[PDB]
């Protein structure tokens, strides 16, 4: 809450604000890039979906990754990594440890790390992930 | 790379003392990682000029492309670091380097709204007409993101360069016309003399525009001069009518240039145009219309006596 | 076509009286058969000028293509009929008409060895560089069939036109160089003055070659003038070295032109070249080499005091 | 509109009178016995008198329109001691750029007030002279920097002789 009093609601805002944090010696977003479990909200927000799931049945022939939404999400990922907003070799440990120090301002996490941030005593808040191109994230 | 990652950490962190000691130990400067990121890349991304300076003192590569195509100039133009852009250009950085998207550094600086970077890039010969994979010029990226002064600069520069090329074109048409009229089957000496005079006047017009562009600090950029539409004109009347059509086209482009200069709030350009160009065009159009109506009244082209006597009495 | 085949028989047979009576009865002149052969086609193939003249008097089509692409001009050039070639060109026949093979009438006249047809076709603007489906120019068809004088004419014409374009190119390089040297960050006025002088001298050289070509009865043919290699020269030394390289190239092409003129037994062209061009090139190369060695001895480009003082004392 | 245009023209008169006094200071710095550069001093005296003429032209214009000239104090230049020929040329360039910027604001104000005579006066007598002066002063600065000044005393002597001579 201290590094950012007003969270953004668009992923398209994340690059620009990152330009601010390098001016303070900070990083905008740092999380585990080594898992699809973290990245699937963004890439599958606007058209990606793991398996087609209807009426309680998962279609096996309908693995959706060759979609324009998955393309858009992965291009946004390569725009966040090409201009060096984040690092590619980062993972969960460095991310959470730096957020406990308060170096990176944003992170994405489930419940299991909440108490860990309660060890940091950083005045923090929790909110929904930003939407992307109007289509909200899909954890 | 025994000290190469030791250079990568100081490039990420910005310690002039660390890199000074590493150059005292002779650390290698071309330490590429798995994705091509050099110590110069991180030195540019960080924005500390001293590590960049000493890296270039020990011979780091200025045009090292990564797996995405970015050079240090690209990243420097993205993040808006003026001095390192200047010293990269001073050390032979390629100003028209394309990335994977075909986006030059000028595309980036116009997309993000950095004026001084745009101007320093224009000084070193950045291409105004470079298109990316979507067919976007930097002018398009500047209007799409609301950087109106960048778009003004980019539009005025292109318009003056096109007017220079158009004045050079018209001189070559008059050269063609002049040497048509002294062929041994077109024996009209005063027609040829008249059109050689016009050729040299248009050469002077183009040189005046070049001098003006140098006084303002803009960048002259020359293109091909295309060949005239005919090698064979047909008569004195037909060539006079083609010359009238030509000067009307030139006048129309000058009026568009004046309207563009008035939108950009440039009174000096407006006064330059209306003092040296707009009255000469009116005079030339009046004189060429005079010649056309007199030649038509005398009975040309189907009277060979008419063009001979026009040659003697009007052009003589 | 009630009298159209009645025109076809007289066109095959050549009766001025028959076609005079058929035009007294108002016979149609555009009688096309199943393969496109008009009465004008047979009138041209036969070689009687009177039937062609009256067919054009009644408005026959001059550019009627058959199913193979031939016009009356093609057939006239094949069979070597000079007067009908002349009057077809006089009535607006397209001189660069391609057949199914892409062969222009000039291809045919060069392949068969008709000099006067070749010359009349060159007077009206026939393309020397037209290639057929095999990539053959008329020069190639003339050397393959032993028509050496045709090939001589075709080679000399192309060489003089290329020298005209090369002199026009060099003037534009000097214009670029001159306006580089009065940018506000390159403040050398006498360099700029020197290169403007060279620009105008090269314009004069090109105009002299154009006047010579008009005195001989040859056909000037202009092409595009391409942009110089740089917009940004780097110093006075570098521009002087580029100018030396340029003038050496021009001298080499002039020597090739002289050797070609000596093979063609043209003493007037040889004396023209060695009187107006070969000594000026030697003088220019000597002067530019002088400038380069003096600038290198003074310590340029890495001495800014050297170029300032060279500007004052040598070019002043 | 009347009240704004009047104030703007009076401020431009005072600004032209200010620039003449800076050039006077610069000129008499360059003939001190420890700064013995005669052609620098001659150059800056010429500029001083030209700026006096610019101010007098604006005063004559204001009298033709029926407006009220109102004079203020002329403040002293920022330095008594310039440091070299290069530094004084750079200060003169900065000065003429400031004057040009205020002239452009005056022209925009005149265009809002629908005054074509003032616009043509400004762009005929003032806007092209500023462009010429800025081009010439930038020329002088780059040549002096290339020759090796200020830390080369041979550079300023020879610039004095060959360019300003």
Author numbering:
A (entry chain B): 140 to 278
B (entry chain A), C (entry chain V): 35 to 350
D (entry chain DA): 186 to 350
What are the paper's exact sentences on this?
In this study, we present a novel DARPin–apoferritin scaffold, with a larger size of around 1 MDa and higher octahedral symmetry, meticulously engineered for the binding and imaging of small target proteins via cryo-EM. The 24-subunit apoferritin framework allows the attachment of up to 24 target proteins without steric hindrance, an extraordinary feature.
We selected MBP (45 kDa) as a new target, given its larger size. However, the MBP-bound DARPin–apoferritin complex did not achieve the desired 24-mer structures, likely because of the strong interaction between the DARPin and apoferritin, as well as between neighboring DARPin molecules, similar to as observed in the GFP-model 6c complex. This characteristic led us to choose model 4 with an anti-MBP DARPin for effective binding (see Section S2). The initial 3D reconstruction, performed using cryoSPARC 3.3.2 and targeting the symmetric core of the scaffold with octahedral (O) symmetry, yielded an overall resolution of 2.69 Å, revealing distinct amino-acid side-chain features [Fig. 4(a)].
